[PDB]
Amino acid sequence: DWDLVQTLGEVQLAVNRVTEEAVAVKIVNIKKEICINKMLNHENVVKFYGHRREIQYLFLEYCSGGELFDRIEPDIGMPEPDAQRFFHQLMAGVVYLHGIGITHRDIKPENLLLDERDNLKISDFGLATVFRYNNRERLLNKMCGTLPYVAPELLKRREFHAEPVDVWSCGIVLTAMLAGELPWDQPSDSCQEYSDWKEKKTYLNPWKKIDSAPLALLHKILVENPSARITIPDIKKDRWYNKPLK
Ligand SMILES: C[C@H](CN(C)C)Oc1nc(Nc2cc3cccc(Cl)c3cn2)cnc1C#N
């Protein structure tokens, strides 16, 4: 038996009556979240233990470290070495997902959990979907995600590639980690902060608070044209991405 100890997000912390093991139980599209979870097995992805239908119950990893969101100090961010480490682990998780043809679609600090060792884990696959199957890519056309984190093509195009969208959102997460703020309400031309970035006014916040090395990476990630946007394999060759830090 598991005792429901407290509400995490519904989602509640459950604790094993015998072993005292802790798990997160999700109490409830749900069919796809379960299916997708069944496919997942990676150290930077929230573990899926199983499910039960009574109201549906999902048994997920308890990440006692909390949400990445709470490691970001407003207007400050966090130490660059910690940001880099979290970004490495995020890429590892995203790489894995894309490798098996899954796109998360809602990457943001609220959905990035930390275990007891502060290892990052991608959470919440309620919006995730298959973008590659039998080695054939399917373009996406449904709008979803979270405005400050979504790529501009999603607002501007009828169809778009899945992967560059996840890459973009990772770029926004990195920005948040290094500056403790989001660069814009949304990646649209009616958005002054977004226009300023497109005009490379990096003497303005949040870019001003970001060292030139990571900023160079951001210049490559937050590129409006998804076809010109840096890919993960190339992120792996980026100077800052490879810089020894602490
Ligand atoms: C509760 C989050 C809300 N999302 C928006 C991230 O959704 C999930 N949380 C999980 N674990 C978890 C969440 C915690 C939340 C707060 C604090 C602590 Cl210690 C937590 C420890 N572990 C696992 N899967 C999902 C899913 N889906």
Given its phi and psi angles, is residue 145 left (phi above 0), alpha (psi -120 to 50 degrees) or beta? left
77 forms beta bridges with 73
Both tokens of residue 216? Answer: 């160079």
Q: What is the 3-state secondary structure (H, E, C) of the chain?
A: CEEEEEECCCEEEEEECCCCCEEEEEECCHHHHHHHHHHCCCCCECCEEEEEECCEEEEEECCCCEEHHHHCECCCECCHHHHHHHHHHHHHHHHHHHHCCEECCCCCHHHEEECCCCCEEECCCCCCEECEECCEECCECCCCCCHHHCCHHHHHCCCECHHHHHHHHHHHHHHHHHHCCCCCCCCCCCCHHHHHHHCCCCCCCCHHHCCHHHHHHHHHHCCCCCCCCCCHHHHCCCCHHHCCCC
What backbone phi and psi angles, to 5 degrees, belong to 225?
Answer: -80, 110
Residue 175 φ/ψ, nearest 5 degrees: -55, -50
Q: Which of 85, 173, 67 is nearest to 123 (CA)?
A: 67
CATH superfamily to which 1-73 belongs: Phosphorylase Kinase; domain 1 (3.30.200.20)
Measured in angstroms, how far is the CA atom of residue 161 from the centroid of ligand 1?
A: 28
Residue located via tokens 């990676």: 42
Task: Point out the residues that are catalytic.
Answer: 106
Query: How far is residue 149's CA from residue 98's CA, in Å, rounded to a whole number?
Result: 18
Q: How is domain 74-246 classified at the CATH fold level?
A: Transferase(Phosphotransferase); domain 1 (1.10.510)
Neighbours of 240 (CB within 10 A): 19
In the chain, CATH 1.10.510.10 covers 74-246
CA 121 from centre of chain:
9
Pick the residue whose CA is nearest to atom 2 on ligand 1: 9
Tell me the CA–centroid distance for residue 26 and ligand 1, in Å: 9
Residue from 5, 7, 11 whose mutation best tests the ligand 1 pocket (most atoms within 8 A of CB): 11
Nearest to 36 by CA among 90, 85, 86, 106: 106
Task: Compute the radius of gyration of the chain from its Cα atoms.
Answer: 18
User: Residue 70: which residues within 8 A CB-CB, separation 6 or more?
Assistant: none
Asked if residue 11 belongs to a known ligand binding site, the reply is yes
Whether the ω angle into residue 206 lies within 30 degrees of 0, i.e. cis, is yes
Tokens of 45: 């992805």
Q: Solved how? A: X-ray
Residue nearest atom 4 of ligand 1, based on CA coordinates: 111
Q: What separation in Å is there between the alpha carbon of 231 and the centre of ligand 1?
A: 29
- Is 10 flagged in the annotation as binding? yes
Q: To 10 degrees, what angle do helices 162-179 and 212-221 make?
A: 150
> Torsion angle, CA of 16/26/119/171, rounded to 10 degrees?
180
- Residue 5 burial by Cβ neighbours in a 10 Å radius (0-12, 13-18, 19+): exposed
Assess contact for 198 and 152: CB atoms under 8 A: no
Ligand 1 binding pocket, CB closer than 6 Å: 8-9, 11, 24, 26, 46, 60-64, 66-67, 110-111, 113, 123-124
122 DSSP β-pair partners: 45, 112
Task: Give the residue range(s) of CATH 3.30.200.20 domains in the chain.
Answer: 1-73
